[PDB]
């Protein structure tokens, strides 16, 4: 799921409380479509509602579908609310709180998002941007290795429980380590910003168990999203629970902090990328992958759907075979996920070509994917004992009404239904003959 889907199901009060922070409003505005942004900007400096027809006349008739979609999305997000214009007309005006916060974020005004940074002076143990990036990469690699099950990576108990609640890994028995499921493989194949966003969404969903304020967590996350890289921020000014949540972020690599009691925290590159690098995989027409990577995580991920051939100290040469792709699919990974992963990790050299990946390789992978699903199997019960067409039609209509029909053929008067509905169909058939 995406941000818009998550925000659609929230109550109006929660949405209004979210708009109280300028950082949240900017993120919501950037998540809007291109057409919606122009409407928001035009209505930013308006103190009076506008007629619905006047707004509808801005976009041409041919692109009315995009206008309708944008209007529906804005109404669902409650960015604007319809106003009862005098004379029976309907006026459209943006939410005053959202508009005020957006103007504060853009034009200026009010207090800063962070309390202060120069009160405590320069950090005694400050790090650099490459160090923060290395720390974030190490944390993410440790998390993903713990997802795989490598003993070298050990995380906190609550983090492991969160993965179990997310369904990526299941713990069949207490004490024994959980096993990664197909959903875990799909999560691994996802892009890093997508993985971070999915993990944050799962955290937000499970936050209701801990009784934490969703609005505060969302506002803090959005503030971290726009935070400048390499600049510390004041820990003070936050509730006790949020700091605890921040500690979990410290385990996730999004936020770096020297000590729990330290008053300085440095947002990392991964935290910035959460709101939204060059790729290290070269794909050749002969079904060969050349990866410029050294960490065991990427090697394992590539070996999930490919056969390894050579491992030079700074290079990995692998071959994409039919058997490897079939094994990966049997593991639960679809071809679309593999193609997306290859495109995301594609080397910058391959970006020169008009297609990111050669069409032949993608077509071959997709065809290999369809090989497993070529045969369709449906367990059920077949009825072929119809003496008359009229009797067959009534039973077929009853089965369709029950919604247990699998296959119908009026030409030969043969039908196939689910075993669960077989008892109901038999009871219906007996009643028709007995009552006759």
């Amino acid at each position: 799921r995406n941000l818009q889907e998550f925000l659609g199901g929230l109550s109006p009060g929660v949405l209004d409380r979210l708009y109280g922070h300028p950082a949240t409003c900017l993120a919501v505005f950037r998540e809007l479509p291109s057409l919606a942004k122009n409407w928001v900007m035009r209505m930013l400096f308006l103190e009076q509602p506008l007629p619905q027809a006047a707004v509808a006349l801005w976009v041409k008739k041919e692109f009315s579908k995009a206008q309708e979609e944008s209007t529906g999305l804005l109404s669902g997000l409650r960015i604007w609310h319809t106003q009862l214009l005098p004379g029976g007309l309907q006026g459209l005006i943006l939410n005053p709180i959202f508009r005020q916060n957006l103007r504060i974020a853009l034009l200026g005004g009010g207090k800063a998002w962070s309390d202060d940074t120069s009160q405590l002076g320069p950090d005694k143990h400050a790090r650099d941007v490459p160090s923060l990036d290395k720390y974030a990469e190490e944390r993410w690699e440790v998390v993903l290795h713990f997802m795989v099950g490598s003993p070298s990576a050990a995380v906190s108990q609550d983090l492991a429980q969160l993965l179990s609640q997310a369904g990526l890994m299941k713990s069949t028995e207490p004490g024994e380590p959980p096993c990664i499921t197909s959903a875990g493989f799909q999560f691994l194949l996802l892009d890093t910003p997508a993985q971070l966003w999915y993990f944050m969404l799962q955290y937000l969903q499970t936050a209701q168990s801990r009784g934490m304020d969703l609005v505060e967590i969302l506002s803090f996350l959005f503030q971290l999203s726009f935070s400048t890289l390499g600049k510390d921020y004041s820990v003070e000014g936050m509730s006790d629970s949020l700091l605890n949540f921040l500690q979990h972020l410290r385990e996730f690599g999004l936020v770096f902090q020297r000590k729990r009691k330290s008053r300085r925290y440095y947002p990392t590159r991964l935290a910035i990328n959460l709101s939204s690098q060059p790729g290290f995989i070269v794909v050749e027409t002969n079904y060969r992958l050349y990866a410029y990577t050294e960490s065991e995580l990427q090697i394992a991920l590539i070996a999930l759907f490919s056969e390894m051939l050579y491992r030079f100290p700074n290079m990995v040469v692998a071959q994409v075979t039919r058997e490897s792709v079939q094994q990966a699919i049997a593991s639960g990974i679809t071809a679309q996920q593999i193609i997306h992963f290859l495109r995301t990790r594609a080397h910058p050299v391959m970006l020169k070509q008009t297609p990111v990946l050669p069409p032949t390789i993608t077509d071959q992978i997709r065809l290999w994917e369809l090989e497993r699903d070529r045969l369709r199997f449906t367990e059920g019960v077949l009825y072929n004992q119809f003496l008359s067409q009229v009797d067959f039609e009534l039973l077929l209509a009853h089965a369709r009404e029950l919604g247990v029909l699998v296959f119908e053929n009026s030409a030969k008067r043969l039908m196939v239904v689910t075993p669960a509905g077989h008892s109901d169909v038999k009871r219906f058939w007996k009643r028709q003959k007995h009552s006759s």
Binding site: Q385, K426, W429, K430
Partner: protein, 57 residues
């Protein structure tokens, strides 16, 4: 040898036009049904010994 070749080249021409159907029809012509326990009915094919067991409502 030329005489043998020129008669062989037309020997099989008439032969190839004799046979018409190659695939053998495998229609299952079941005989009378046999009633077993639990309302089971079994039909035995007289062409290949094929057996079909079903339940009649």
């Amino acid at each position: 040898k030329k005489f043998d070749k020129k008669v062989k080249e037309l020997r099989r021409a008439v032969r190839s036009s004799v046979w018409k159907r190659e695939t053998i029809v495998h229609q299952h012509e079941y005989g009378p049904e046999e009633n077993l326990e639990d309302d089971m009915y079994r039909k035995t094919c007289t062409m290949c010994g094929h057996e079909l067991t079903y339940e009649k409502m």
